């Protein structure tokens, strides 16, 4: 626990990127989280939504 | 069959060409809700039930 001030900084910098990568997998109200899955099932007018 | 006794047919291990069913003007109501009829020819299906 001597280098805890640096360990906390490293852990926070890693957890921020982890949370960003996890939120990349969110749906945000769409039909799917993957972009190619929506771009390959719906038409343009319906895919843009 | 009747509406209250509708039959469900298993469709598996075959190639389904939906372009013929889409290009046929005999159907009066052809509306999808999850996907588009144009992308049906370029996508597989896990389980098909009619």
From Swiss-Prot, chain B:
Changing residue 29 to A: In strain: Omicron/BA.2, Omicron/BA.2.12.1, Omicron/BA.4, Omicron/BA.5, Omicron/BQ.1.1, Omicron/XBB.1.5, Omicron/EG.5.1. Attaches the virion to the cell membrane by interacting with host receptor, initiating the infection. The major receptor is host ACE2. When S2/S2' has been cleaved, binding to the receptor triggers direct fusion at the cell membrane. When S2/S2' has not been cleaved, binding to the receptor results in internalization of the virus by endocytosis using host TFRC and GRM2 and leading to fusion of the virion membrane with the host endosomal membrane. Alternatively, may use NRP1/NRP2 and integrin as entry receptors. This is Spike protein S1. It comes from the Viruses. Changing residue 26 to P: In strain: Omicron/BA.1, Omicron/BA.2, Omicron/BA.2.12.1, Omicron/BA.2.75, Omicron/BA.4, Omicron/BA.5, Omicron/BQ.1.1, Omicron/XBB.1.5, Omicron/EG.5.1. Changing residue 21 to I: In strain: Omicron/XBB.1.5, Omicron/EG.5.1. The chain holds residues 348 to 397 of 1273 of the full protein. Binds to host ACE2. RBD also interacts with the N-linked glycan on 'Asn-90' of ACE2. Cleavage of S generates a polybasic C-terminal sequence on S1 that binds to host Neuropilin-1 (NRP1) and Neuropilin-2 (NRP2) receptors. Interacts with host integrin alpha-5/beta-1 (ITGA5:ITGB1) and with ACE2 in complex with integrin alpha-5/beta-1 (ITGA5:ITGB1). May interact via cytoplasmic c-terminus with M protein. May interact (via N-terminus) with host bilirubin and biliverdin, thereby preventing antibody binding to the SARS-CoV-2 spike NTD via an allosteric mechanism. It comes from Severe acute respiratory syndrome coronavirus 2.
């Amino acid at each position: 626990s001597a280098l805890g001030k640096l360990q906390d900084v490293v852990n926070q910098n890693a957890q921020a990127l982890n949370t960003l990568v996890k939120q990349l997998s969110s749906n945000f109200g769409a039909i799917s989280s993957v972009l190619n899955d929506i771009l390959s099932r719906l038409d343009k007018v319906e895919a843009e939504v | 069959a009747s509406v209250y006794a509708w039959n469900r047919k298993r469709i598996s291990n075959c190639v389904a060409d939906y372009s013929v069913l889409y290009n046929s003007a005999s159907f009066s109501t052809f509306k999808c809700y999850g996907v588009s009829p144009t992308k049906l020819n370029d996508l597989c299906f896990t389980n098909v039930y009619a």
